[PDB]
Write a protein that binds this ligand. Structure first.
Ligand SMILES: Nc1ncnc2c1ncn2[C@@H]1O[C@H](COS(=O)(=O)NC(=O)[C@@H](N)CO)[C@@H](O)[C@H]1O
Length: 224
């Protein structure tokens, strides 16, 4: 029966687990509509993550620097969703939110030209405008490995083999037919990711090792 304490000290008593989105809705329609994620006992969580016990909660919106960072991170997922449609055999490596933007390192035999990047951004806009829900699922290490192995995503598989413990539960984020892996949080719906643009591309060695393949780093930025 969690007691949720908000930043101003107000408390909400519940007799069942509730997510940040559930609480936002209880507070009001405006806050629920603005809700991107939550901070529970100091840690960022997705808006759909259940809060089982008494906790301090803060609702994250686009007015928070954290909300902007989450929007940027989900735009990296959007880039993957789009690039996988334009060039299906593209392999996804790492795509983080960085200062002032985001990027995604990709393995594609085709060297992307300015026109290709423009085509990629165009598809991203079309997909984001569909306002689809981002579906999160926490799975076992092996379940995540099989998901990516079946998609031929060798870099994601390498990440599981070398950088994620067998006892950790990878977070999978589904964007329609596209799936990515992350600690998140990510936006609850792509309606929060309509304002972005792709910039330039650069070369980036996988794992920073010049003996490994030089991937194409696609930079972008987003705002809200
Ligand atoms: N439980 C976890 N679930 C998923 N990723 C995790 C987890 N713990 C640690 N990670 C690491 O966090 C990385 C996320 O990297 S990221 O650059 O922020 N994001 C991504 O590469 C993609 N989500 C695309 O945006 C994963 O590749 C993995 O190395």
């Amino acid at each position: 029966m969690p007691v949720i304490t908000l930043p101003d000290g107000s408390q909400r008593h519940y007799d069942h687990a509730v997510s940040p989105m559930d609480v936002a809705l209880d507070i009001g329609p405006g806050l629920a509509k603005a809700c991107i994620a939550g901070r529970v006992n100091g840690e960022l969580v997705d808006a759909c993550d259940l809060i089982e016990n008494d906790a301090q909660l803060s609702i994250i919106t686009a007015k928070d620097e954290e909300g902007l960072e989450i929007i940027r991170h989900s735009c990296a997922h959007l880039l993957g969703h789009a690039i996988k449609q334009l060039w299906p055999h593209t392999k996804m490596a790492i795509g983080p939110v960085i200062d002032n933007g985001f990027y995604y390192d990709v393995d594609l035999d085709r060297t992307l030209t300015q026109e290709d990047v423009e085509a990629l951004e165009k598809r991203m806009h079309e997909l984001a405008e569909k306002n689809y829900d981002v579906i999160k699922k926490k799975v076992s290490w092996h379940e995540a490995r099989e998901t990516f192995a079946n998609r031929g995503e060798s870099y994601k598989v390498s990440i599981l083999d070398e950088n994620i413990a067998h006892d950790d539960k990878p977070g999978l984020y589904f964007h329609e037919e596209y799936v990515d892996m992350c600690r998140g949080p990510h936006v609850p719906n792509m309606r929060f990711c309509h304002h972005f643009k792709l910039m330039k591309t650069a070369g980036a060695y996988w794992r920073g090792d010049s003996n490994n393949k030089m991937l194409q780093r696609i930079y972008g930025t987003a705002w809200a």
